[PDB]
Each structure stands twice: as structure tokens, then as C-alpha cells.
Coordinates of C-alpha atoms in Angstrom, one line a residue:
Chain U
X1 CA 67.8 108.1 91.0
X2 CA 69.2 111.6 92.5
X3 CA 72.3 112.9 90.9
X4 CA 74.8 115.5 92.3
X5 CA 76.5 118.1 90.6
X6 CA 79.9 119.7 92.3
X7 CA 81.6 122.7 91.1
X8 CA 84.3 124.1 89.7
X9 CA 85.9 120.5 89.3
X10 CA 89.4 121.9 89.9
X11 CA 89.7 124.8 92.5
X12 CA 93.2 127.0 92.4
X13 CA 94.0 128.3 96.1
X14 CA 96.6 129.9 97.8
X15 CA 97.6 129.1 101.6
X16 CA 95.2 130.9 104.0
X17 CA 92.6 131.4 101.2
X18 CA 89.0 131.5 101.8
X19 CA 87.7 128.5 99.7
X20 CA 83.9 127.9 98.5
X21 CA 82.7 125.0 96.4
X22 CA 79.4 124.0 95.9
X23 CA 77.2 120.8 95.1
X24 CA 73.7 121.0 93.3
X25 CA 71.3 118.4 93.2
X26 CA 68.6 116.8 90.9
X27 CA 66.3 117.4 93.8
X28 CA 65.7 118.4 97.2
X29 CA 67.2 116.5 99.4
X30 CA 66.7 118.4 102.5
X31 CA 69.7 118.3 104.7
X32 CA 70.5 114.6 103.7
X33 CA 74.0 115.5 102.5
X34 CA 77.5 114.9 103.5
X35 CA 81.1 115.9 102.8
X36 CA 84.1 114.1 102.7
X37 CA 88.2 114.9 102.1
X38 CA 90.5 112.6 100.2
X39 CA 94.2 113.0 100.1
X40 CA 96.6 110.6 98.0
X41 CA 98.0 108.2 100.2
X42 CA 95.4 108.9 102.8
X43 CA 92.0 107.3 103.9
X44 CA 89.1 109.4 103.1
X45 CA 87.5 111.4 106.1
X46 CA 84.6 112.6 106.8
X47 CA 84.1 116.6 107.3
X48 CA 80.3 117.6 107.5
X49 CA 77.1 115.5 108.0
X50 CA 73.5 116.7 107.7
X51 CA 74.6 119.6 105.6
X52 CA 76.4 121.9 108.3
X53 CA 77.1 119.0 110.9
X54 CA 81.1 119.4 111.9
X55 CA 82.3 116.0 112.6
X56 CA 84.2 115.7 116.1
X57 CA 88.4 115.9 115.5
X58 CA 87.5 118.3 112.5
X59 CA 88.5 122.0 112.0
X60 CA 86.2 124.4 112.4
X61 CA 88.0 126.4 109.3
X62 CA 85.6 123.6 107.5
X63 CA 81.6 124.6 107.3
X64 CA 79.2 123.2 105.4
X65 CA 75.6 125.4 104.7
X66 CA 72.2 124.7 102.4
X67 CA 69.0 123.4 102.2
X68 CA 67.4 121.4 99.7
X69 CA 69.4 121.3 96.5
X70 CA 72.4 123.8 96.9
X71 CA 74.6 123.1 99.5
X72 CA 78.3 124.0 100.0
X73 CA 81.4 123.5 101.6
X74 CA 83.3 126.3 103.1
X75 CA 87.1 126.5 104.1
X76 CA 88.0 129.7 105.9
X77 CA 91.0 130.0 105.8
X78 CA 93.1 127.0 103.4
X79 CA 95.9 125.2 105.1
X80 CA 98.6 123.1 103.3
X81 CA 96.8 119.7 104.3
X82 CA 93.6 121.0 102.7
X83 CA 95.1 120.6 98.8
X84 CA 93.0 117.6 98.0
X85 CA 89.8 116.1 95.9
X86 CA 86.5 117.2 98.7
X87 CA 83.4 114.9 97.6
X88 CA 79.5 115.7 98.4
X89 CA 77.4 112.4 99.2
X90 CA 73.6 112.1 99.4
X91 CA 71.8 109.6 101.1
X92 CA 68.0 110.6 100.6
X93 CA 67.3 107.4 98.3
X94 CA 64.9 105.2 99.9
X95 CA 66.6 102.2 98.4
X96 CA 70.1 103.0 99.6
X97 CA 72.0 104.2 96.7
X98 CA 74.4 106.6 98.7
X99 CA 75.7 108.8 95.5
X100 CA 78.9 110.4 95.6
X101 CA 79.5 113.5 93.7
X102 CA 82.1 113.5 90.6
X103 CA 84.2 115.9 93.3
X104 CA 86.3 118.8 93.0
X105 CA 90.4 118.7 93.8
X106 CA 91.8 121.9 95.2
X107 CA 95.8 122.7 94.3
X108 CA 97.7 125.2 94.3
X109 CA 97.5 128.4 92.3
X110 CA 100.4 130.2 90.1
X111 CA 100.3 131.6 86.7
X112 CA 98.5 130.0 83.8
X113 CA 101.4 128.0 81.6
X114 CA 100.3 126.3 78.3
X115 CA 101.1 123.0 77.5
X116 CA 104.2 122.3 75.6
X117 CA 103.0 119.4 73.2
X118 CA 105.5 116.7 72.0
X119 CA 104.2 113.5 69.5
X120 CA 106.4 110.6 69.3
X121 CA 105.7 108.0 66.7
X122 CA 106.4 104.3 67.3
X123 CA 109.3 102.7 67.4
X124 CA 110.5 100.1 64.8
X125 CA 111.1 97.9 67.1
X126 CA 107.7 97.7 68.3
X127 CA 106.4 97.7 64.6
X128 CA 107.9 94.4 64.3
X129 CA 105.7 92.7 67.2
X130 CA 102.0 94.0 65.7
X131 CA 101.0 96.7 67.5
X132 CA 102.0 101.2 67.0
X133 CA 101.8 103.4 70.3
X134 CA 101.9 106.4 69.2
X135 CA 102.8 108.9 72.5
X136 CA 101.5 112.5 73.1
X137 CA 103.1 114.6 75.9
X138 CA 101.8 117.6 77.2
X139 CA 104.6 119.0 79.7
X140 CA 104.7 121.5 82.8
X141 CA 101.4 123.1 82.5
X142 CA 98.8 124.9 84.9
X143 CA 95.9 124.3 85.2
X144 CA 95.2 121.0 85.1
X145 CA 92.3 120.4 82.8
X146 CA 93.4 119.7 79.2
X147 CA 92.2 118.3 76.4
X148 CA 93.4 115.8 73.7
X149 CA 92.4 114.6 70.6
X150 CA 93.7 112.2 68.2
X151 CA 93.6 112.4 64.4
X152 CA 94.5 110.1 61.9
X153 CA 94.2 111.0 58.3
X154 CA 91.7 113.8 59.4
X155 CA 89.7 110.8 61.1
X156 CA 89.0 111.5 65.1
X157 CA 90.0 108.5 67.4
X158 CA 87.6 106.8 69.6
X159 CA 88.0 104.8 72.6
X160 CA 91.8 104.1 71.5
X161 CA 93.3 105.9 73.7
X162 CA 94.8 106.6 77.1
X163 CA 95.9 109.5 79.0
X164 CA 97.7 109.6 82.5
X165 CA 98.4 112.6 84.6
X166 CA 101.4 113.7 87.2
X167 CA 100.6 114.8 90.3
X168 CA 101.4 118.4 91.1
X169 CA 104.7 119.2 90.8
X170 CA 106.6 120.2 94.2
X171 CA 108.7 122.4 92.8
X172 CA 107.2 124.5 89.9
X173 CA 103.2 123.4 90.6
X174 CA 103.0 122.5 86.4
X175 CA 101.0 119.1 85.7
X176 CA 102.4 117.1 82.9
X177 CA 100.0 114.4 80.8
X178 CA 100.8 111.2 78.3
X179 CA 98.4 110.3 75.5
X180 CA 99.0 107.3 74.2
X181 CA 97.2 106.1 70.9
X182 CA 97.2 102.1 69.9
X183 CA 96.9 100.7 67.0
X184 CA 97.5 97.2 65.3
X185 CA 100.4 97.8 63.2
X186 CA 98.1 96.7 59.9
X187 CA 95.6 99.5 60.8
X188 CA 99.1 101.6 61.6
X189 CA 100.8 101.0 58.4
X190 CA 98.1 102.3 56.2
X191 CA 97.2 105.6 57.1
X192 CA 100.0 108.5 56.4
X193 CA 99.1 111.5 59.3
X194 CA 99.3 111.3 62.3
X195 CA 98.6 114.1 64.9
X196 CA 97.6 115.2 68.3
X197 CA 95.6 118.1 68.8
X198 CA 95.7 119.6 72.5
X199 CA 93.1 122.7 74.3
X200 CA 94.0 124.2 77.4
X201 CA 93.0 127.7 79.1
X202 CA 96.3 128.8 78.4
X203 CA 96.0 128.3 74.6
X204 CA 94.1 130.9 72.4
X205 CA 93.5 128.1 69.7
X206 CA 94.3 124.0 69.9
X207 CA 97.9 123.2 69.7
X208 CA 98.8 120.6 66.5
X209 CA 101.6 118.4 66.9
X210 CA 101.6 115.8 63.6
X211 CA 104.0 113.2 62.2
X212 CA 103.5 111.5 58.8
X213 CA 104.6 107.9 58.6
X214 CA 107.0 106.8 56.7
X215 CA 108.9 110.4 56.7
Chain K
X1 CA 81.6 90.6 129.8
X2 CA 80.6 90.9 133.5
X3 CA 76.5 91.3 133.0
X4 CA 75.1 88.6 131.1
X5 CA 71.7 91.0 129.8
X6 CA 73.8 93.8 128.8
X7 CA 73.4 94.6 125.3
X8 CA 74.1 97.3 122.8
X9 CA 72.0 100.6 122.0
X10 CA 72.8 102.6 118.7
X11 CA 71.1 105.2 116.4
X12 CA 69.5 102.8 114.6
X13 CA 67.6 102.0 118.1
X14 CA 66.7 105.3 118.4
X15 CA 65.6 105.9 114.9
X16 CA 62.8 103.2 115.3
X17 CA 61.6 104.0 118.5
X18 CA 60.9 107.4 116.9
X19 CA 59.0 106.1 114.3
X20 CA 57.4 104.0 116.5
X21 CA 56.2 107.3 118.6
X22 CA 55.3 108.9 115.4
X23 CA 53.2 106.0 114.0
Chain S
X1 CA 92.7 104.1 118.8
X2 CA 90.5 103.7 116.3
X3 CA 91.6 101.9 113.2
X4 CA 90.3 100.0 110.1
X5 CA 93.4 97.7 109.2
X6 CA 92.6 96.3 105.7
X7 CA 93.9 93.3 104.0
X8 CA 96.2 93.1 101.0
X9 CA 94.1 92.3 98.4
X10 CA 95.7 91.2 95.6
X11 CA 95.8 90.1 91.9
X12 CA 92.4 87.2 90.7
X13 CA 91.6 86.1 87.2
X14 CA 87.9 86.8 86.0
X15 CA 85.4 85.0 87.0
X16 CA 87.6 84.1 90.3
X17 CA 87.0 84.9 94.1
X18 CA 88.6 87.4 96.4
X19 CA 87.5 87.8 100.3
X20 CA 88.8 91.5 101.3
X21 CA 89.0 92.0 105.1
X22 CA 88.9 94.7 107.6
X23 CA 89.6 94.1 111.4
X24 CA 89.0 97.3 113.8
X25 CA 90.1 98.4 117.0
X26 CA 89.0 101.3 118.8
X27 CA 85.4 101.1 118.8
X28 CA 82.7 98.7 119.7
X29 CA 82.2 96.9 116.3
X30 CA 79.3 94.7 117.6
X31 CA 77.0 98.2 117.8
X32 CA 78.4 99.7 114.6
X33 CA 77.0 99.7 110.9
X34 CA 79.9 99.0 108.4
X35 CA 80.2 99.5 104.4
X36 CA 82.5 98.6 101.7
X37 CA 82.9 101.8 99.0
X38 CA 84.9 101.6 95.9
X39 CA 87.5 103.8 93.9
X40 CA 88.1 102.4 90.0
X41 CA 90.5 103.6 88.1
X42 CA 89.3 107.0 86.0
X43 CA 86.1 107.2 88.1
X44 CA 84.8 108.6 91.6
X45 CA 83.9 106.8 94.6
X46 CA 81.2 104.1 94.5
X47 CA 79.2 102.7 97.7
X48 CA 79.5 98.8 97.2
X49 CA 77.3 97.7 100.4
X50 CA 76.2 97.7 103.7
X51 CA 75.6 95.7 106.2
X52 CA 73.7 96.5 110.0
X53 CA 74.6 94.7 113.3
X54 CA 73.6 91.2 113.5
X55 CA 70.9 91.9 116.1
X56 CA 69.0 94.2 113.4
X57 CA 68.7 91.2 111.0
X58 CA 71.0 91.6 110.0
X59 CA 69.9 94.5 107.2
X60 CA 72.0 94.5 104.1
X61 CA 71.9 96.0 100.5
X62 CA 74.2 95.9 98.1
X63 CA 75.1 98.6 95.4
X64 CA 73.2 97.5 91.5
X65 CA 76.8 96.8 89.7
X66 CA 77.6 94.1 92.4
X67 CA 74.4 92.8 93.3
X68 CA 74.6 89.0 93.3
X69 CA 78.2 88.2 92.9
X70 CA 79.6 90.0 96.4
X71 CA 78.4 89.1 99.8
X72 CA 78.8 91.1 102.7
X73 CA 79.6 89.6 106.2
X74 CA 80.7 90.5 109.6
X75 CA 82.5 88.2 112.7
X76 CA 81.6 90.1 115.9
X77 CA 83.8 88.4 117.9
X78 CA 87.0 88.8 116.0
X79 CA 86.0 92.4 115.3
X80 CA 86.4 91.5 111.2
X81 CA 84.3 92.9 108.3
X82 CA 84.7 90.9 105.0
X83 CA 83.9 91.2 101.4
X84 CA 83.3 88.3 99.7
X85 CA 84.0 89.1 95.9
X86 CA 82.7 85.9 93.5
X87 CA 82.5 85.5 89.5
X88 CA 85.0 89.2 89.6
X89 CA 84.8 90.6 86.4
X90 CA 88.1 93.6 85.2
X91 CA 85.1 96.2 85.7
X92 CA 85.3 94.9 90.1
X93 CA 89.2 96.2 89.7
X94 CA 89.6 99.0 92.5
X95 CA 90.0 100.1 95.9
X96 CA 87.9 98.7 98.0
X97 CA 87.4 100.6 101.6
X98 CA 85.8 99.5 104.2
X99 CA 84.0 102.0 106.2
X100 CA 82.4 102.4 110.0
X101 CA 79.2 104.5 108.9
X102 CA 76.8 106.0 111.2
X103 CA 73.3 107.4 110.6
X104 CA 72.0 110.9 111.8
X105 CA 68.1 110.9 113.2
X106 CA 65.7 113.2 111.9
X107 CA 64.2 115.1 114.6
X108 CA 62.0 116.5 112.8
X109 CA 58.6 115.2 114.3
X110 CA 57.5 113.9 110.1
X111 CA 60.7 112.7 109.3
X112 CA 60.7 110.8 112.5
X113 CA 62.3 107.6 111.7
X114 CA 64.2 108.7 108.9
X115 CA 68.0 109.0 109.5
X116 CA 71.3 110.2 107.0
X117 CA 73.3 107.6 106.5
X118 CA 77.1 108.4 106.4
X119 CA 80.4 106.8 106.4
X120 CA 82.2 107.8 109.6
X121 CA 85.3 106.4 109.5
X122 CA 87.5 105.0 106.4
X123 CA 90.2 102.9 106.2
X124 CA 92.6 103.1 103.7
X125 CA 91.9 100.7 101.1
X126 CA 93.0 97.6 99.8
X127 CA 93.6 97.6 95.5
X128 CA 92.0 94.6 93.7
X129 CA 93.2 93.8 90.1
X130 CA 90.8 91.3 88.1
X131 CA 93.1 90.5 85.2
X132 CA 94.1 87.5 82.9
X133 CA 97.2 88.6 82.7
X134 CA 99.9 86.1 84.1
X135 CA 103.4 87.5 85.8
X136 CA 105.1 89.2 82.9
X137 CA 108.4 91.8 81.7
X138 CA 107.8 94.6 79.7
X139 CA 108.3 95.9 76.5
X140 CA 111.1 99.0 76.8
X141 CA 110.5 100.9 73.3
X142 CA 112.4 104.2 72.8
X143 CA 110.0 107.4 72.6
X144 CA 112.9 109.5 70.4
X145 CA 113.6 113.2 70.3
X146 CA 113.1 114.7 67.1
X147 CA 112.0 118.4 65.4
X148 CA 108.5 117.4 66.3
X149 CA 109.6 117.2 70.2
X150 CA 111.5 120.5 70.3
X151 CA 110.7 123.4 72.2
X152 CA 113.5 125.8 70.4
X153 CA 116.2 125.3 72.8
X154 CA 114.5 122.1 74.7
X155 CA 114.1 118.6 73.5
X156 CA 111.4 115.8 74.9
X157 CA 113.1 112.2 74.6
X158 CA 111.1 108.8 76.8
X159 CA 110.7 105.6 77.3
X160 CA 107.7 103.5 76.9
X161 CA 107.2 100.4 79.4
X162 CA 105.0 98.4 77.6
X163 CA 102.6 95.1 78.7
X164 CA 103.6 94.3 81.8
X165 CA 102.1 92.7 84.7
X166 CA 101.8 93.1 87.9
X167 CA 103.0 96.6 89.8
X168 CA 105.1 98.1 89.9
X169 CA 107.9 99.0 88.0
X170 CA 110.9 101.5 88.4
X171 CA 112.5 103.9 85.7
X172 CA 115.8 105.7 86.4
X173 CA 117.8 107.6 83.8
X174 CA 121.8 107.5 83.3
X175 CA 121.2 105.2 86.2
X176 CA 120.3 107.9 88.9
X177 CA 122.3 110.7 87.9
X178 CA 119.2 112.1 85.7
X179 CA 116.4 113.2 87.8
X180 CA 115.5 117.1 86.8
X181 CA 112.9 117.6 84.1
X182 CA 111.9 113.6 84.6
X183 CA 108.1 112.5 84.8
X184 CA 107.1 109.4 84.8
X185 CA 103.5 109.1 84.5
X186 CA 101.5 106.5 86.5
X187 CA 101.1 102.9 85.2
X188 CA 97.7 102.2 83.1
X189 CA 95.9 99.0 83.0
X190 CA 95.1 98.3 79.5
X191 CA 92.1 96.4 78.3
X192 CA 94.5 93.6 77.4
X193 CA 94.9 93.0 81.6
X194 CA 98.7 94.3 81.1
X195 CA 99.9 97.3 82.4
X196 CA 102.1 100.3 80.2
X197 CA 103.6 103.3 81.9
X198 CA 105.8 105.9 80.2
X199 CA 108.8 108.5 81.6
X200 CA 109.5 111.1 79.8
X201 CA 112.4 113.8 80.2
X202 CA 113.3 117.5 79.4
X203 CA 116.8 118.4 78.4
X204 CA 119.1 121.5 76.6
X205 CA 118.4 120.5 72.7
X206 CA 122.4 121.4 72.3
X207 CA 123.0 117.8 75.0
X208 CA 121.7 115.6 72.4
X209 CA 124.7 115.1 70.9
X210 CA 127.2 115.4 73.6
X211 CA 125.1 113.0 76.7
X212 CA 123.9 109.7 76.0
X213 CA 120.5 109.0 77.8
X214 CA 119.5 105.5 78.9
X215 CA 116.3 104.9 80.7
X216 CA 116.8 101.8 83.5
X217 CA 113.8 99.7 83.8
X218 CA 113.4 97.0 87.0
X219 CA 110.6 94.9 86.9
X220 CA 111.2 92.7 90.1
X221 CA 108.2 90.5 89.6
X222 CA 109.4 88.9 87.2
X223 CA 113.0 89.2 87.4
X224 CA 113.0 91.8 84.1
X225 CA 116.0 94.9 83.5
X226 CA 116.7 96.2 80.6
X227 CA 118.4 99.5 79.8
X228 CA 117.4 101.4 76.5
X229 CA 119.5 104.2 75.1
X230 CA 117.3 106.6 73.7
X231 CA 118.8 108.7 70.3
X232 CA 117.3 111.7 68.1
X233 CA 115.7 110.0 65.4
X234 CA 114.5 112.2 62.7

């Protein structure tokens, strides 16, 4: 029963930056820590054992420090490749529980851009087979944390809901996220206002978009 | 597979015998 | 070289059986520890078990959330690692990785005995669905411009791909010649065990009445293409 802590969960960099994030734990653990890379679309790897061990065929741009319950993960100077999720792992459990911290994804740094919030109510054609989506889009915006919530009728919606998120964009380094609210068309048809309200850092107050059935 | 008593030595080998001194 | 080559995986109903494998090269498997660790959808990675050379016992444990319905193996002689998956439930969908882990004495004199236990090596991965979804099109269902998708001079128009099953799917506009401003977001596997995706696109508000926009959906599974003009609906 140890539990990890790694921050900041999202990292903004620039290419030959000097990167630090850090993993706290419940407890000491002495030096029975390790850190590991993943990459979409590539196995995970290994980077430091025992704390400030550099595994063999690793950079030495990577170093890991700490003792006890603070450790962290160094990156002297960021390379392209290095854009990724970095995860912290414990293995101080006597029964072997091997606990992975909630990790923290590194991308690439420009300017703060808000969210641009679209709401798209369902289609009549889809009203005919029983069931409403109604679609949230939060387009080309930096960084990627962001936050929705669903209102209907003033109500908040719970556990109805799904979000999916684009991977950094090549070109203008914006993420882009879909909420999508279901509903069975009789639960649908009798409630009148329906909105999505969206938080982000680049937006001084939440961001309302709202439809009212029927009009 | 030339020597038939060859076998296979590993941390986990080493890890025991340790504990083994220490105990 | 050293590799992990991992099966396919594939698609099981709940409560059936799946046997994940991983064959190495590389290394000498017979004096090596191995895991299985887990990515599911949303959350982080999960160690799923262990298992120590056959000499040593051999030694296995096995992660709370799958102890009792997955059994870890290993065939020296074929270099093979397997995961025996039984009674899966849609919780068990994921990556599945197997691992070549090592462990790191203490030399410290009162920790002698103790070690760090790591995963040395990955492969990379091998998806699992549990699902009682059977081979199925989807659902196209227009996601419509309107003044509540306008951004003064831009407009937001989509196409929602609806309870399908299984991956993947393919979305093209005006059959190719769209692509700037276009996301489509990745697929999500609903609680119904049927998968939904939307694309979305960008485009000058004034277009909306001078382009038509058509979002082409392939689903070769099951043999599935439809085309949807999407229109300004206000």
C-alpha cells in the first residue's frame, strides 16, 4: 500500500531544454525506484533503476537523483525523441505490488491558445433509433489539460460521458478534444437546455456553449 | 549444450547467497 | 538482438479465454525473470504478474485485479512467455506487455537479500478487447454547423461514427481532397462493447454555402461505406 505522486502531469519544453520532474512518495522507499519512457507507437524503456542507476544503451542527458520519498528525473538537455509520457515505478512492497506512477507527458511548448468550443445537438436521424449524442468540440488549443462539464436543465452530468483527445498537432502544436454526452432519447426529449461548459488556462472564466431542444 | 552440469547463475542467485551470509 | 515479439491478441467475449504470447531472442530466457504489465484505456500502467525461472520454483505472483482468473507460464525451450487469460471480464481490455525484468541487489550489509525489482526490457504490446459486441457497421449521423459552431468567420461541421465493432475505421472528407483543419479523434469503446469515433473539420463560414462537405466512412470489417453530406442546420 505505497502510492506515488509525479509532477507537473503535463511538462511544456522546448528542444535542448533542461527538463526536471519529480515523483513523491507515501513513504520512504529508499532507493527502490525506477524510471521509465513511453512513446506512442513504441515499447516502453527503461531509463533509471535504483533511483540514479543509468541503464546501459541510455543517454547520459537522462539522470535520475533522491532518497527516500523525493526522487526525480532529470533531462539535460531535451531532444526531439524525448517528447513523451516518463513514468516513476516503486518496488519496495514486500508483497510485490510494483506501482507505477499516474506519469507526466512532456510536449512541446508555444503560446497559450484557448479552446474554441463548438456544441452540436443530435441528429434526427439518430433520434429516431432511441438514443441523443450530443457532441462538444474543443478545437486547436494549448495546453492540453481542459476541462468539461455537462449541463442539462442546470443539472450536472455524471458518468454519461466521454471525451477523446488528438495527439499533438505537427504543424501548429494545438490539441483538439470531443465530449460526447448520451442519452436515451426519452430522457433526451424531456429536458429543454442543453450546454457544455469548458475551463482551460487560457480562459479567465468557463466558456458556455448551450443549445435548447426543440429550437 | 556441450557440458551436461552447466547451469545458469542470475541475481536472484546472488541476492540469496547474500542473505544467506547475512543470516 | 534482443527482442520480445508479441502475439496478436485479439477480440474474446466475457467470460472467454485468451492465451497472449511472447517469444524472445537475444538473451538467455532460461536465466531471466519475465512479467506481463498492462495499459487500459484512460488509465496508467498496471503490473499484471510475474513469474521466476523454473529452477527458483518456479516463484509467481500475480497483481489483486487478476488474481485467480490469469495464469502465468513460461516454455524454456521454445524461449515463449504466455499469459493465460480465463473468465475475461471488459475491465481485462488493454495492452498487455510482456517484459524481461531484472532485480538490483542491495549491498547494503542490512538490506542484504533484498533486491529492486524492475522491468528491463519491454515489448511492444499486444491489445486485448473483452466485448459482446459481434462484427458490426456504424451509425454515420451528421454533427451540423450552426451559429452555435461559429467562430465569427469559421464554422465547425462533423461526423459521428457511431456503434461499431471491431477497429478500425477510416474518415475522409470530399473523398481526399479535404484534409486541413480535419481531426478525427480516436475511437472510444463504449460500455455497450461498441466502438464511436467522431471527425470534426474547420472551414471559412462564407464556404458553407458554396462547397458541399461529405465525410467517407470505410468500415472494412464488416463490409460498411457510407458517405454523409453534412449541411448548416439552424
Amino acid at each position: 500500500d505505497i502510492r506515488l505522486t509525479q509532477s507537473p502531469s503535463s511538462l511544456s519544453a522546448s528542444v535542448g531544454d533542461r527538463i526536471t520532474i519529480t515523483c513523491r512518495a507515501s513513504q520512504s522507499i529508499k532507493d527502490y525506484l525506477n524510471w521509465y519512457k513511453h512513446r506512442p507507437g513504441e515499447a516502453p524503456k527503461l531509463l533509471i533503476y535504483s533511483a540514479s542507476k543509468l541503464r546501459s544503451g541510455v543517454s547520459s542527458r537522462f539522470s535520475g537523483s533522491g532518497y527516500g520519498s523525493a526522487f526525480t528525473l532529470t533531462i539535460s538537455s531535451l531532444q526531439p525523441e524525448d517528447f513523451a509520457t516518463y513514468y516513476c515505478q516503486e518496488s519496495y512492497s514486500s508483497v510485490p505490488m510494483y506501482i507505477f506512477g499516474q506519469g507526466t507527458k512532456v510536449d512541446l511548448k508555444r503560446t497559450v491558445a484557448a479552446p474554441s468550443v463548438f456544441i452540436f445537438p443530435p441528429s434526427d436521424e439518430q433520434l429516431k433509433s432511441g438514443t441523443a449524442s450530443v457532441v462538444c468540440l474543443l478545437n486547436n488549443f494549448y495546453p492540453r489539460e481542459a476541462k468539461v462539464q455537462w449541463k442539462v436543465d442546470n443539472a450536472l452530468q455524471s458518468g454519461n460521458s466521454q471525451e477523446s483527445v488528438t495527439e499533438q498537432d505537427s504543424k501548429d502544436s494545438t490539441y483538439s478534444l470531443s465530449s460526447t454526452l448520451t442519452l436515451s432519447k426519452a430522457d433526451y426529449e424531456k429536458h429543454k437546455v442543453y450546454a457544455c461548459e469548458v475551463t482551460h488556462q487560457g480562459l479567465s472564466s468557463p466558456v458556455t456553449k448551450s443549445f435548447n431542444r426543440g429550437e | 549444450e556441450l557440458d551436461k552440469w552447466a547451469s545458469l547463475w542470475n541475481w536472484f542467485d546472488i541476492t540469496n547467497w547474500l542473505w544467506y551470509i547475512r543470516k | 538482438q534482443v527482442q520480445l515479439v508479441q502475439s496478436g491478441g485479439g477480440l474474446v467475449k466475457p467470460g472467454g479465454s485468451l492465451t497472449p504470447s511472447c517469444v524472445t531472442s537475444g538473451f538467455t530466457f532460461s536465466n531471466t525473470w519475465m512479467s506481463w504489465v498492462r495499459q487500459t484505456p484512460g488509465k496508467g500502467l498496471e503490473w499484471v504478474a510475474r513469474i521466476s525461472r523454473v529452477g527458483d520454483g518456479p516463484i509467481i505472483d500475480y497483481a489483486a485485479p487478476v488474481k485467480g482468473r490469469f495464469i502465468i507460464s513460461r516454455d524454456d525451450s521454445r524461449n515463449t512467455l504466455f499469459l493465460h487469460m480465463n473468465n475475461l471480464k471488459t475491465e481485462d481490455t488493454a495492452v498487455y506487455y510482456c517484459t524481461a525484468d531484472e532485480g538490483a541487489p542491495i549491498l547494503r550489509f542490512f538490506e542484504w537479500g533484498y533486491y529492486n525489482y524492475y522491468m528491463d526490457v519491454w515489448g511492444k504490446g499486444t491489445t486485448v478487447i473483452v466485448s459482446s459486441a459481434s462484427t458490426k457497421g456504424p451509425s454515420v449521423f451528421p454533427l451540423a454547423p450552426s451559429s452555435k459552431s461559429t467562430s465569427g468567420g469559421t464554422a465547425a461541421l462533423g461526423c459521428l461514427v457511431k456503434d461499431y465493432f471491431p477497429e478500425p475505421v477510416t474518415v475522409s472528407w470530399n473523398s481526399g481532397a479535404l484534409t486541413s483543419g480535419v481531426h478525427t479523434f480516436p475511437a472510444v469503446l463504449q460500455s455497450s462493447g461498441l466502438y464511436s469515433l467522431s471527425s470534426v473539420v474547420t472551414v471559412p463560414s462564407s464556404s458553407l454555402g458554396t462547397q458541399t462537405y461529405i465525410c467517407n466512412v470505410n468500415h472494412k470489417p464488416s463490409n460498411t461505406k457510407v458517405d454523409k453530406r453534412v449541411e448548416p442546420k439552424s
